[PDB]
Amino acid sequence: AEPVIDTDGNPLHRGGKYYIMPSIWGPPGGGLRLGKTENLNCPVTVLQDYSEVINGLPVEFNIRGILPRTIFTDTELNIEFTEKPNCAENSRWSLFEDDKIHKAYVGIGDSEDHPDQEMLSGSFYIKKHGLRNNTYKLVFCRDGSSTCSDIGRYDNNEDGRRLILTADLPYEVVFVNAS
């Protein structure tokens, strides 16, 4: 395991705030934010913006304990936007099963913010993606099972791309310190 490094060369740390941006080695666009989908009018769906000029919302990483710390590729964590729409219960990322497109996608809030979609409980890790310098992927590990899946993008034409569990094309990201 190694420290996760932001675009300035600085390790990620508890209490940092970061834009998650696409690495040049994969398809482009902008940062992560929230948006409504056709049957969820509260913006509780995580979306990657189509436009490179849109930084989106900063995320911060929730970790066991409270002490200041470096974040490593083996640090179990939860991911949260630093902002929350008031129609949502929380700003923490969870996976929800969408039966329309048959994908588990990333959203915020509780089960009632995504009615009739099963909510998966688990935690995230930030893993090195391939060998390009200081690029990463997000990995989600489900509570109750011993196996994890990569996070990749999926375009459902909702003014941005969703983040889904994939076995195929991990989203390769860099972390931009928002402060």
Automatic annotation (TrEMBL):
Gene Ontology MF: a single term: serine-type endopeptidase inhibitor activity
Entire protein: shown range: 28 to 206 of 216
UniProt keyword list: Disulfide bond, Protease inhibitor, Serine protease inhibitor, Signal
Highest taxon of source: Eukaryota
SS bond list: 42-87, 141-148
Taxonomic lineage: Eukaryota, Viridiplantae, Streptophyta, Embryophyta, Tracheophyta
Keyword Nucleotide-binding belongs to the record: no
Protein name from the UniProt record: Kunitz-type trypsin inhibitor-like 2 protein
